[PDB]
Short mmCIF file of C-alpha atoms and ligand atoms in Angstrom, two decimals:
data_model
loop_
_atom_site.label_atom_id
_atom_site.label_comp_id
_atom_site.label_asym_id
_atom_site.label_seq_id
_atom_site.Cartn_x
_atom_site.Cartn_y
_atom_site.Cartn_z
CA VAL A 1 0.04 0.18 -0.02
CA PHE A 2 1.34 3.39 -0.93
CA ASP A 3 -1.43 6.44 -0.34
CA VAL A 4 0.30 9.47 -1.39
CA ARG A 5 -0.69 14.64 -5.68
CA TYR A 6 1.80 11.92 -6.33
CA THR A 7 1.07 9.24 -9.34
CA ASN A 8 2.76 6.52 -11.41
CA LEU A 9 4.95 4.75 -8.83
CA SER A 10 8.23 2.71 -9.36
CA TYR A 11 10.31 0.37 -7.01
CA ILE A 12 13.57 1.81 -6.22
CA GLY A 13 14.70 -0.42 -3.03
CA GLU A 14 13.52 -1.49 0.13
CA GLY A 15 15.28 -1.82 3.45
CA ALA A 16 14.57 -1.90 7.51
CA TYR A 17 13.31 1.81 7.13
CA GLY A 18 10.38 0.46 4.79
CA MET A 19 10.19 0.99 0.89
CA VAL A 20 11.31 4.11 -1.41
CA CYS A 21 9.46 4.74 -4.85
CA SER A 22 9.62 7.30 -7.52
CA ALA A 23 6.77 9.19 -8.24
CA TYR A 24 5.35 12.37 -10.12
CA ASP A 25 4.66 15.53 -8.39
CA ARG A 26 9.53 13.15 -10.66
CA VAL A 27 10.43 12.86 -6.69
CA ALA A 28 11.38 10.14 -4.24
CA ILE A 29 9.00 8.73 -1.69
CA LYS A 30 9.56 6.49 1.16
CA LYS A 31 6.86 4.78 3.42
CA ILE A 32 7.64 4.68 7.17
CA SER A 33 5.88 2.40 9.54
CA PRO A 34 7.43 3.20 13.11
CA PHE A 35 4.80 3.38 15.61
CA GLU A 36 5.30 -0.07 17.07
CA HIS A 37 8.65 0.44 18.32
CA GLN A 38 10.53 3.19 20.48
CA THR A 39 13.65 2.84 18.46
CA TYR A 40 12.11 3.17 15.10
CA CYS A 41 10.24 6.30 16.63
CA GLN A 42 13.48 7.88 17.61
CA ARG A 43 15.22 7.41 14.39
CA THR A 44 11.96 8.78 12.37
CA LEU A 45 11.95 11.83 14.50
CA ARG A 46 15.98 12.31 14.22
CA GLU A 47 15.32 12.42 10.47
CA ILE A 48 12.28 14.45 10.19
CA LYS A 49 13.68 17.35 12.96
CA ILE A 50 17.00 17.42 11.26
CA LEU A 51 16.50 17.27 7.37
CA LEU A 52 13.84 20.12 7.98
CA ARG A 53 16.24 22.28 9.71
CA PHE A 54 18.94 21.87 7.26
CA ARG A 55 19.04 23.55 3.77
CA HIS A 56 22.28 22.62 1.85
CA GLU A 57 23.05 21.59 -1.79
CA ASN A 58 24.72 18.40 -0.38
CA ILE A 59 22.11 17.14 2.20
CA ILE A 60 19.03 15.61 0.85
CA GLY A 61 16.09 17.91 1.68
CA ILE A 62 12.45 16.84 2.81
CA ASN A 63 9.91 18.36 0.20
CA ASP A 64 6.67 17.25 1.77
CA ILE A 65 5.36 14.76 4.58
CA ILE A 66 2.37 12.70 4.31
CA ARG A 67 0.52 11.37 7.15
CA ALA A 68 -3.18 11.19 8.28
CA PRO A 69 -4.98 14.28 9.79
CA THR A 70 -5.26 12.78 13.27
CA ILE A 71 -2.72 10.90 15.57
CA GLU A 72 -5.28 8.11 16.01
CA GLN A 73 -5.16 7.57 12.29
CA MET A 74 -1.75 7.87 11.78
CA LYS A 75 -0.14 4.49 11.30
CA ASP A 76 2.49 5.37 8.37
CA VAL A 77 4.34 8.30 7.19
CA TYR A 78 5.44 9.27 3.73
CA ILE A 79 8.50 11.43 3.37
CA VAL A 80 8.96 13.23 -0.20
CA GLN A 81 12.49 14.06 -1.23
CA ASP A 82 14.12 15.26 -4.49
CA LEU A 83 14.68 12.03 -6.68
CA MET A 84 18.48 11.00 -7.43
CA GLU A 85 19.70 8.38 -10.02
CA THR A 86 22.01 6.03 -7.73
CA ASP A 87 23.61 6.00 -4.66
CA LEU A 88 27.90 5.53 -4.31
CA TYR A 89 27.28 1.72 -3.21
CA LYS A 90 25.42 0.78 -6.61
CA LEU A 91 27.98 2.97 -8.29
CA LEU A 92 30.96 1.39 -6.86
CA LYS A 93 29.47 -2.44 -7.92
CA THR A 94 30.00 -1.14 -11.70
CA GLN A 95 31.96 1.67 -12.05
CA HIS A 96 36.11 1.90 -11.16
CA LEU A 97 36.18 5.74 -10.57
CA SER A 98 38.48 8.03 -12.16
CA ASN A 99 40.67 10.55 -9.69
CA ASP A 100 39.06 13.64 -10.68
CA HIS A 101 35.52 11.79 -9.77
CA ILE A 102 36.73 10.70 -6.33
CA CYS A 103 38.05 14.04 -5.66
CA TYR A 104 34.99 15.75 -6.72
CA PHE A 105 32.94 13.37 -4.81
CA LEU A 106 34.89 13.63 -1.76
CA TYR A 107 34.98 17.54 -2.06
CA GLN A 108 30.96 17.27 -1.84
CA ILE A 109 30.75 14.85 1.14
CA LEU A 110 33.23 17.10 3.26
CA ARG A 111 31.40 20.41 1.97
CA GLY A 112 28.25 18.75 3.28
CA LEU A 113 29.71 17.61 6.25
CA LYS A 114 30.90 21.08 7.06
CA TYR A 115 27.48 21.99 7.34
CA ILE A 116 26.17 19.35 9.50
CA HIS A 117 29.24 19.70 12.06
CA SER A 118 28.55 23.54 11.95
CA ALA A 119 25.24 22.59 13.40
CA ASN A 120 26.84 20.86 16.43
CA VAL A 121 25.04 17.41 14.37
CA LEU A 122 27.06 13.95 14.08
CA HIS A 123 25.70 12.01 11.12
CA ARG A 124 27.19 8.64 12.57
CA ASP A 125 26.43 6.35 9.72
CA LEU A 126 28.45 7.77 6.74
CA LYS A 127 28.66 5.14 4.32
CA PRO A 128 28.38 4.73 0.23
CA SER A 129 24.62 3.77 0.05
CA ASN A 130 24.06 6.91 2.12
CA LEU A 131 25.56 9.12 -0.65
CA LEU A 132 23.04 9.77 -3.28
CA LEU A 133 24.37 10.71 -6.85
CA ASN A 134 22.93 12.08 -10.14
CA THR A 135 24.20 12.14 -13.63
CA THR A 136 25.70 15.75 -13.22
CA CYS A 137 27.47 14.19 -10.82
CA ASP A 138 25.92 16.01 -7.79
CA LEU A 139 26.17 14.12 -4.11
CA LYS A 140 23.87 14.46 -1.33
CA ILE A 141 24.12 12.65 1.85
CA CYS A 142 21.00 10.96 3.26
CA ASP A 143 20.05 9.03 6.20
CA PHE A 144 19.84 10.86 9.60
CA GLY A 145 18.20 8.32 11.48
CA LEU A 146 21.36 7.52 13.59
CA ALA A 147 22.30 11.40 14.07
CA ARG A 148 22.74 13.20 17.50
CA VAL A 149 23.92 16.32 18.89
CA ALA A 150 27.48 16.24 19.27
CA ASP A 151 28.67 15.60 23.31
CA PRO A 152 32.33 15.42 23.74
CA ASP A 153 31.82 15.66 27.68
CA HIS A 154 29.80 12.53 27.50
CA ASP A 155 31.73 10.69 24.92
CA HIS A 156 33.41 7.96 26.94
CA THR A 157 32.50 4.23 27.53
CA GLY A 158 33.93 0.83 28.39
CA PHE A 159 35.64 -1.33 26.13
CA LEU A 160 33.78 -3.30 23.65
CA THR A 161 30.56 -1.55 24.19
CA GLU A 162 27.61 -2.39 21.79
CA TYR A 163 27.19 -0.19 19.00
CA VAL A 164 24.35 0.26 15.97
CA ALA A 165 26.14 2.31 13.00
CA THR A 166 27.29 0.11 10.01
CA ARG A 167 30.27 -2.19 11.32
CA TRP A 168 32.80 -1.50 8.45
CA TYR A 169 32.54 2.12 8.77
CA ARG A 170 33.41 2.44 12.87
CA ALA A 171 36.33 4.37 13.77
CA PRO A 172 38.74 2.28 16.20
CA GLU A 173 37.98 4.24 19.39
CA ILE A 174 33.85 2.83 19.34
CA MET A 175 35.38 -0.56 20.45
CA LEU A 176 37.94 1.06 22.60
CA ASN A 177 36.32 3.64 24.64
CA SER A 178 34.08 5.93 22.64
CA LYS A 179 30.03 6.19 22.16
CA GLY A 180 30.50 8.24 18.85
CA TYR A 181 29.52 11.46 20.29
CA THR A 182 32.20 13.62 18.67
CA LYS A 183 32.64 14.84 15.16
CA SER A 184 35.96 12.45 14.40
CA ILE A 185 33.41 9.65 14.34
CA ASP A 186 32.19 11.02 11.04
CA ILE A 187 35.74 11.79 9.68
CA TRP A 188 36.94 8.38 10.09
CA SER A 189 33.75 6.75 8.24
CA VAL A 190 34.56 9.63 5.21
CA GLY A 191 38.46 8.25 5.17
CA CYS A 192 36.45 4.58 4.79
CA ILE A 193 34.70 5.94 1.84
CA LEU A 194 37.65 7.63 0.37
CA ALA A 195 39.44 4.26 0.67
CA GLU A 196 36.49 2.22 -0.95
CA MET A 197 36.15 4.71 -3.90
CA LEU A 198 40.20 3.99 -4.59
CA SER A 199 39.51 0.47 -4.70
CA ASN A 200 36.08 -0.37 -5.44
CA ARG A 201 36.66 -2.64 -1.98
CA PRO A 202 35.70 -1.81 1.49
CA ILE A 203 39.21 -1.18 3.61
CA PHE A 204 37.99 -2.73 7.00
CA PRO A 205 35.34 -5.45 6.14
CA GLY A 206 35.10 -6.93 9.87
CA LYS A 207 33.22 -10.00 10.01
CA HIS A 208 31.86 -9.16 13.52
CA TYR A 209 32.39 -6.58 16.34
CA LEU A 210 36.05 -7.20 17.50
CA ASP A 211 37.11 -8.10 14.09
CA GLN A 212 36.45 -4.84 13.06
CA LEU A 213 39.29 -3.70 15.19
CA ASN A 214 41.49 -6.42 14.24
CA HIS A 215 41.15 -5.28 10.51
CA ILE A 216 41.74 -1.59 11.43
CA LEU A 217 44.88 -2.67 13.47
CA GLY A 218 46.05 -4.61 10.53
CA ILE A 219 46.64 -1.82 8.50
CA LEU A 220 47.64 1.05 10.70
CA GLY A 221 49.95 -1.23 12.75
CA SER A 222 50.27 -1.15 16.57
CA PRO A 223 49.22 2.27 18.22
CA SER A 224 52.13 4.57 19.59
CA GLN A 225 52.64 4.77 23.35
CA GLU A 226 51.17 8.41 23.13
CA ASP A 227 47.98 6.98 21.52
CA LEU A 228 47.86 4.15 24.18
CA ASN A 229 48.10 6.94 26.78
CA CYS A 230 44.98 8.76 25.34
CA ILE A 231 43.27 5.38 25.85
CA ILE A 232 41.24 5.90 29.10
CA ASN A 233 39.90 2.52 29.93
CA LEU A 234 42.13 -0.30 31.78
CA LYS A 235 40.83 -2.99 29.55
CA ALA A 236 41.60 -1.16 26.37
CA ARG A 237 44.96 -0.48 27.14
CA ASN A 238 45.62 -3.93 28.11
CA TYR A 239 44.11 -5.48 25.13
CA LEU A 240 46.25 -3.00 23.16
CA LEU A 241 49.39 -3.86 25.13
CA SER A 242 48.92 -7.85 24.75
CA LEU A 243 48.94 -8.08 20.97
CA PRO A 244 51.99 -8.89 19.26
CA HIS A 245 53.75 -5.87 17.46
CA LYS A 246 52.21 -4.93 14.11
CA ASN A 247 54.06 -2.62 11.27
CA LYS A 248 51.49 0.10 9.50
CA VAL A 249 50.47 -1.30 5.96
CA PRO A 250 51.71 1.40 3.93
CA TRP A 251 48.99 3.52 2.03
CA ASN A 252 50.85 3.26 -1.55
CA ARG A 253 50.94 -0.70 -1.17
CA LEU A 254 47.31 -0.61 -0.62
CA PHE A 255 46.41 1.81 -3.23
CA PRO A 256 49.30 1.64 -5.84
CA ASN A 257 47.67 3.52 -8.52
CA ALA A 258 46.21 6.62 -5.96
CA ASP A 259 47.28 10.18 -6.16
CA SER A 260 49.86 10.83 -3.50
CA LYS A 261 47.77 13.78 -2.09
CA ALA A 262 44.60 11.68 -2.07
CA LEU A 263 46.67 9.31 0.04
CA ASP A 264 47.92 11.95 2.57
CA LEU A 265 44.63 13.05 2.81
CA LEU A 266 43.26 9.35 3.72
CA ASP A 267 46.22 9.07 6.46
CA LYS A 268 45.07 12.12 8.40
CA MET A 269 41.58 11.14 8.03
CA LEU A 270 42.33 7.54 9.14
CA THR A 271 44.36 8.55 11.98
CA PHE A 272 43.91 5.89 15.13
CA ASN A 273 43.82 8.70 17.63
CA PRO A 274 40.43 10.82 17.39
CA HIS A 275 42.18 13.96 18.89
CA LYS A 276 45.19 13.81 16.14
CA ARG A 277 42.58 13.08 13.32
CA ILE A 278 42.01 15.81 10.79
CA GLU A 279 38.64 17.84 11.28
CA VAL A 280 36.30 18.62 8.40
CA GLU A 281 37.67 22.37 7.60
CA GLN A 282 41.22 20.97 7.67
CA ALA A 283 40.24 18.26 5.39
CA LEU A 284 38.78 20.99 2.84
CA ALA A 285 42.07 22.75 3.13
CA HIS A 286 43.96 19.87 2.36
CA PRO A 287 46.07 20.10 -1.16
CA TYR A 288 44.14 17.07 -2.67
CA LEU A 289 40.92 19.42 -2.86
CA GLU A 290 42.73 22.74 -3.72
CA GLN A 291 40.98 23.01 -6.97
CA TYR A 292 37.71 23.20 -5.35
CA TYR A 293 38.51 24.81 -2.06
CA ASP A 294 36.54 28.08 -1.54
CA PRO A 295 35.55 28.55 2.19
CA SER A 296 33.08 31.38 0.75
CA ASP A 297 31.11 28.85 -1.04
CA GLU A 298 31.30 26.24 1.86
CA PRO A 299 28.40 27.37 3.93
CA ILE A 300 27.63 26.88 7.69
CA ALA A 301 24.41 26.75 9.66
CA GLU A 302 22.88 29.89 10.95
CA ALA A 303 22.58 28.26 14.66
CA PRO A 304 23.46 25.23 16.15
CA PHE A 305 21.00 22.25 16.83
CA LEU A 306 14.67 11.02 22.93
CA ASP A 307 16.52 8.05 24.34
CA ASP A 308 14.02 7.66 27.66
CA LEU A 309 10.80 9.30 25.83
CA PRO A 310 8.09 6.13 25.37
CA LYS A 311 6.93 5.47 21.64
CA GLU A 312 3.64 7.18 22.54
CA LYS A 313 5.13 10.64 23.10
CA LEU A 314 7.72 10.30 20.33
CA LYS A 315 4.69 9.65 17.93
CA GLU A 316 2.98 12.80 19.37
CA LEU A 317 6.64 14.69 18.35
CA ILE A 318 6.35 13.20 14.99
CA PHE A 319 2.76 14.10 14.45
CA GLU A 320 3.46 17.89 15.37
CA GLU A 321 6.88 18.09 13.51
CA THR A 322 4.61 17.31 10.43
CA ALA A 323 2.11 19.36 11.10
CA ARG A 324 3.60 22.06 8.97
CA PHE A 325 2.95 20.14 5.34
CA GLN A 326 -1.08 19.55 6.05
CA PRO A 327 -3.59 21.36 3.73
CA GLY A 328 -4.20 25.08 5.10
C1 F8V B 401 19.95 5.72 2.14
S1 F8V B 401 18.25 4.99 2.04
C2 F8V B 401 16.91 6.16 2.57
C3 F8V B 401 16.74 7.31 1.83
O1 F8V B 401 16.97 8.42 2.02
N1 F8V B 401 16.92 6.92 0.69
C4 F8V B 401 16.52 7.67 -0.59
C5 F8V B 401 16.03 9.32 -0.23
C6 F8V B 401 16.18 10.14 -1.59
C7 F8V B 401 16.29 9.40 -2.81
N2 F8V B 401 16.29 10.29 -3.72
N3 F8V B 401 16.78 9.26 -5.08
C8 F8V B 401 16.96 8.07 -4.41
C9 F8V B 401 17.53 7.08 -5.15
C10 F8V B 401 18.53 5.88 -4.42
C11 F8V B 401 19.15 5.16 -5.19
C12 F8V B 401 18.65 4.75 -6.49
F1 F8V B 401 19.04 3.72 -7.31
C13 F8V B 401 17.88 5.74 -7.31
C14 F8V B 401 17.39 6.86 -6.45
C15 F8V B 401 16.52 8.25 -2.95
C16 F8V B 401 16.85 7.29 -1.95
C17 F8V B 401 15.47 5.60 3.01
C18 F8V B 401 15.30 5.42 4.48
N4 F8V B 401 16.19 6.71 5.05
C19 F8V B 401 16.23 7.10 6.47
C20 F8V B 401 14.78 7.21 7.31
O2 F8V B 401 13.94 7.57 6.49
N5 F8V B 401 14.81 7.20 8.60
C21 F8V B 401 13.64 7.38 8.91
C22 F8V B 401 13.07 5.61 9.10
N6 F8V B 401 14.05 4.94 10.05
C23 F8V B 401 13.58 3.81 10.52
C24 F8V B 401 12.22 3.31 10.95
C25 F8V B 401 11.95 2.32 11.26
C26 F8V B 401 12.62 0.99 10.97
C27 F8V B 401 12.21 -0.14 11.21
N7 F8V B 401 10.75 -0.47 11.15
C28 F8V B 401 10.40 -1.64 11.02
C29 F8V B 401 11.36 -2.80 10.88
C30 F8V B 401 12.67 -2.29 11.29
N8 F8V B 401 12.98 -1.20 11.42
C31 F8V B 401 14.08 1.41 10.90
C32 F8V B 401 14.75 2.71 10.93
C33 F8V B 401 15.49 5.41 9.66
C34 F8V B 401 15.63 6.87 9.38
C35 F8V B 401 17.32 6.70 4.24
#
């Protein structure tokens, strides 16, 4: 059932979120049915609240929202967004990208991320399938379902703490001492996306939770004494000290045909210690992106921007947040 002004539906894809179609206003329309679970309501409210406050060329917008006229009759919510042609995940299954496509797509990811981070927001699930593309090579970041307001003072957690965001794009600190409440979480994922664009393969394809950290240390090598000193947890320190010494796999052996400036930026985004990891503004200013770098054309948000609310209260908040799209 797709009850939506919008006609001639055509299937694009599906996932845990629900189903996404194309339709004539040509737009994208996704049907969300989250009201039976608190977690689904939280993700829906984050997506809506955030995307409605953001206005940026490299961030997907929300054009319209369809739902019943009362809270009692609201069972689904339809979100209308700009139609794109594909995503980076699908493109990388069939095309090897030239360096100048990688450079421009990376520029756009970091331009959008500058804006998100300037609003004090973390995306927390950056990956190729969340980067939408068209034939004119415009790139738009999507899926803010796991987004949060940054909170570096409460980022600390114990060793091997469970995490929801996509495993292959998790920074090493997620497995050691971090809840993913700092902007450095997103820079790591962007580093993983760059590596993936360079070889059409995920750089750190962990098969399970701790294997993710095995893959990261397998390439970066053993962390320095200084980086071990920044690790707060007794258990995380003991674990890292227990491992055999491993030397760093050089970027030019993993990526023998990549541009040397792309590999220098990659090295800086994939820095083990999050305190030493390059920030979004510094990455935009890196020599690899010099042809595109223009701070005057990299806008920021006008002002900065659930866990213990029951699903019923979250449904009322979603109802209120979507009220602006009703007739009159
Ligand atoms: C990256 S997929 C996405 C999206 O925005 N897609 C999208 C949005 C706009 C688009 N324009 N053009 C294309 C497109 C893409 C590829 C292609 F080949 C052609 C066109 C396109 C695709 C669709 C969903 N959206 C996130 C998103 O909408 N939200 C809200 C929902 N949320 C959620 C809610 C419920 C559940 C659940 N429910 C039941 C059982 C289990 N789980 C889980 C999660 C998650 C956060 C992200």
